[PDB]
Amino acid sequence: ALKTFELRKQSQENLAEQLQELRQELASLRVQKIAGGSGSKLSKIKTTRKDIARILTVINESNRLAAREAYKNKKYIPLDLRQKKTRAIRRALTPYEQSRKTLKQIKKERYFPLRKYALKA
């Protein structure tokens, strides 16, 4: 099984060039197994499905990372490159605008803030 470590230090075109070679290989084993396949064929399929998944991950990981870099310091970015969390969290007041106060209130907390004190018994 190819490791993700050396699957992440090559370009996409050759990385996509590894996609179809694994695709027909998986397809070929299915042809062999329906005409008589040993236990290795079941594993060789099982190994190659995860192997196809591993390289598909690094294609999608790198493609998104390319999109994230391209849409850095942009005001509006695609919905895919955005936080999800929950729907209500995305609608709540941001911490900045929850901290907004009128200039009347700023003068209250500047001249008369809650003091730190103690009572001697």
Binding site: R91, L93, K101
Partner: protein, 166 residues
């Protein structure tokens, strides 16, 4: 100021000036939709004291309801359904005739940044104010369910409270 003159003129609702304007505008409002957007309030004194500011995020809507529940409560709810993305702030009476009562409803956009950055109307952005008119939290809604302070206005008396040591 001019809102002192506007608000004392609004007490003489059947005077010559007010009666002519009531009948002229009632005909005009009937040619429009049942619920239609108002470019500016027809009572700038009354909207202003009910929380309306002439700024982005504040919307005035007119609605006519049939005469013959509370008329003002239904106007708030119908407009709230029509503009589902806005929060109903308040509402008031603008006009009436033999058949229809006309109301203007003040709505606030909880998603506009001019609302979310204004601490004086920042409270309406919180989810607890979703459809205030639907839960009887507006001015007329609170009055409808007899909310107030005084002798003029159940579960804790239909239950047996059995303590541990009794």
């Amino acid at each position: 100021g001019a809102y002192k003159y506007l608000e004392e003129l609004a007490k003489k609702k059947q005077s010559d000036v007010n009666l002519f304007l009531s009948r002229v505008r009632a005909w005009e409002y009937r040619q429009m939709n049942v619920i239609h957007r108002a470019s500016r309030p027809s009572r700038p004194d009354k909207a202003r004291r009910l929380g309306y500011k002439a700024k982005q995020g504040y919307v005035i809507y007119r609605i006519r309801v049939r005469r013959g529940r509370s008329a003002r409560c239904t106007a708030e709810e119908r407009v709230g359904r029509y503009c589902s993305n806005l929060r109903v702030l308040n509402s008031y009476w603008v006009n009436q005739d033999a058949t229809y009562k006309f109301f203007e409803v003040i709505l606030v956009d909880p998603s506009h940044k001019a609302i979310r950055r204004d601490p004086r109307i920042n409270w309406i952005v919180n989810p607890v104010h979703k459809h205030r008119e639907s839960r009887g939290l507006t001015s007329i809604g609170k009055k409808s369910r007899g909310i107030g302070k005084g002798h003029r206005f159940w579960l804790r008396h239909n239950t047996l409270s059995l303590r541990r040591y009794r």
